[PDB]
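Field: COMPLEX_INPUT
Field: COMPONENT_COUNT = six
Field: RESIDUE_TOTAL = 522
Field: MODE = joint
Values follow.
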Amino acid sequence: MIQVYSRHPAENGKSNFLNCYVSGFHPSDIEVDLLKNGERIEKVEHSDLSFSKDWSFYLLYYTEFTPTEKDEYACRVNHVTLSQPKI
Amino acid sequence: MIQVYSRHPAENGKSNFLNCYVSGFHPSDIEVDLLKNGERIEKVEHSDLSFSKDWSFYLLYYTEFTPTEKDEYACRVNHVTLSQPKI
Amino acid sequence: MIQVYSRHPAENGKSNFLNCYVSGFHPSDIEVDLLKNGERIEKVEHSDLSFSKDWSFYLLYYTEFTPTEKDEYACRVNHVTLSQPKI
Amino acid sequence: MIQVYSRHPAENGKSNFLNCYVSGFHPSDIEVDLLKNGERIEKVEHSDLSFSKDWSFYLLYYTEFTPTEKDEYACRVNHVTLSQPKI
Amino acid sequence: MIQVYSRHPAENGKSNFLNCYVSGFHPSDIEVDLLKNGERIEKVEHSDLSFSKDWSFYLLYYTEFTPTEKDEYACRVNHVTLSQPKI
Amino acid sequence: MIQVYSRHPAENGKSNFLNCYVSGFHPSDIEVDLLKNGERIEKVEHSDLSFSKDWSFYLLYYTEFTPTEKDEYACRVNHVTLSQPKI
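Field: COMPLEX_OUTPUT
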């Protein structure tokens, strides 16, 4: 007998907002599961749940890397109000 | 006997809004599952749930990488109000 | 007999907001699990849950790395108010 | 995996022979069985294998029991030979 | 894994022979069994294997028991030979 | 893993032979068993294997027991030979 009681009442402005510049590897809210709720299981073999192997931002082989850039970031944010009254 | 009680009452402005620039690898809200609720299972073999293997933002072989760019980011946000009254 | 009582009532502005510049490897809110709730399980073998192997920001082989850049970061944030009254 | 190896090579003159007088309750070679060889059985309920309840040779109610008998037992057995050579 | 190796090579003149007089309750070679060989059985309830309840040779109620008998037992046995050579 | 090796090579003239008079309660060679060989059994309840309850040779209620008997036992046994050579 397994009983699970999961509650997530409220979320306000969870993630990734009001950003001038976002880049790169940013996966979010990803759920990978096997036999999350299991009862009376004889066997389970050869399970592979590897998310990734190698993280390399710059991987160059016999390369000539010459980027020229002049980037100006001038984002403006005014009067942002977040309210979560709870009674 | 397995009993699950999952509640998600409210979400307001979850993700990825009011952004000047978004790029790259950003998958979201992805669910991959096998036998999430299982009862009286004899066996389960050779399960592969690998999400990915290799993350490489720049992967170059015998390359001449010469990008010239002049990018100006001038986004403006005014009077953003988020309200979640709860009584 | 397994009983689980998990509660997450409230979240306000969780992560990654009001940022001038975000880059790199930043995955978030990722859950990988195997047999999270298990009862009367005879055996489980050969489980692999490796998230990653190698983290290398700069990985170069026989490379000439000559980037020229003049980047100016001038983001402005005014009058940000976060309120979470609880009664 | 259940393996049963039952051998009964030889029987010679098993029972109830060369008898002058046999009477009464003598049942023989009676086998009563339920699920003699069973594998992976979830449940089994309300099994009744009672052979008998009450043994009463003389059961009399308000009876007048007056038997007169003159019985002579004069059986003769000569030169009975039992041979079971085993090589 | 259950392995049973039962051997009964030889029996010679097992029981109840060359008897002048046999009477009463004498059942023989009676086997009553439930789930003799069982593997991976969750439950088994309410099993009744009672052979008998009450043994009463003389059970009389308000009875007049007056038997007259003159019994002579004159059985003769000569030259009984039992041989079981084993080599 | 349960392994049973039972051997009963030889029996010669087991029981109840060459008897002048046999009476009463004499059951023989009776086997009553439940789950003789059992492996990985969760539960077993309410088992009743009572062979008998009460043994009363003379049970009389308000009885007049007046048996008259003149019994003569004159059985004769001559030259009984039992041989079990083992080499």
